[PDB]
Design a protein around this ligand. Structure first.
Ligand SMILES: OC[C@H]1O[C@@](CO)(O[C@H]2O[C@H](CO)[C@@H](O)[C@H](O)[C@H]2O)[C@@H](O)[C@@H]1O
Ligand SMILES: [Cl-]
Ligand SMILES: [Cl-]
Ligand SMILES: [Cl-]
Ligand SMILES: [Cl-]
Ligand code: NA
Ligand code: NA
Ligand code: NA
Ligand code: NA
Length: 129
């Protein structure tokens, strides 16, 4: 599924992301934009051999199991393939674990480099929420 911007904002808010660990809804929408371009099916192999999956590009080294990442933890206890669904429930539950892990949203490279410090409220502008 390719989410619309406001569509994803509403799903994220419904799942309780708005101000989760103090991160406003705009931060999460911005992160999704630059991690996956709002595409639940997005996958990207990383240099260490792990792969990032789904709307928030959750990683196979720590968070989900894709059966091809040695040293793999699966801290969200979920197959990575389950993070590609049109239903973002699993991705959101896992993201909640990631952002609570110590470094907040800095865990997401694209958020740190492209969202952090910016006018993230723009990402929910015009949405009926
Ligand atoms: O996720 C924990 C830890 O892993 C790092 C390593 O670069 O980021 C990886 O995991 C993120 C969350 O799944 C991915 O978005 C990212 O692309 C992937 O490199 C750290 O940034 C993070 O603290
Ligand atoms: Cl915001
Ligand atoms: Cl693995
Ligand atoms: Cl959803
Ligand atoms: Cl924080
Ligand atoms: Na898609
Ligand atoms: Na939309
Ligand atoms: Na915030
Ligand atoms: Na992998």
């Amino acid at each position: 599924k390719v989410f619309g911007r406001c569509e994803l904002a509403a799903a994220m808010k419904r799942h309780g992301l708005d101000n989760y660990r103090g991160y406003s809804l705009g931060n999460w929408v911005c992160a999704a934009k630059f991690e996956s371009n709002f595409n639940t099916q997005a996958t990207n192999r990383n240099t260490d051999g792990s792969t990032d999956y789904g709307i928030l590009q959750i990683n196979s080294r720590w968070w989900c199991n894709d059966g091809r990442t040695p040293g793999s933890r699966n801290l969200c206890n979920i197959p990575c393939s389950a993070l590609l669904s049109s239903d973002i429930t699993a991705s959101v539950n896992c993201a909640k674990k990631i952002v609570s892990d110590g470094n907040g949203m800095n865990a997401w490279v694209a958020w740190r480099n492209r969202c952090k410090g910016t006018d993230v409220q723009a990402w929910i502008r015009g949405c009926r929420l």
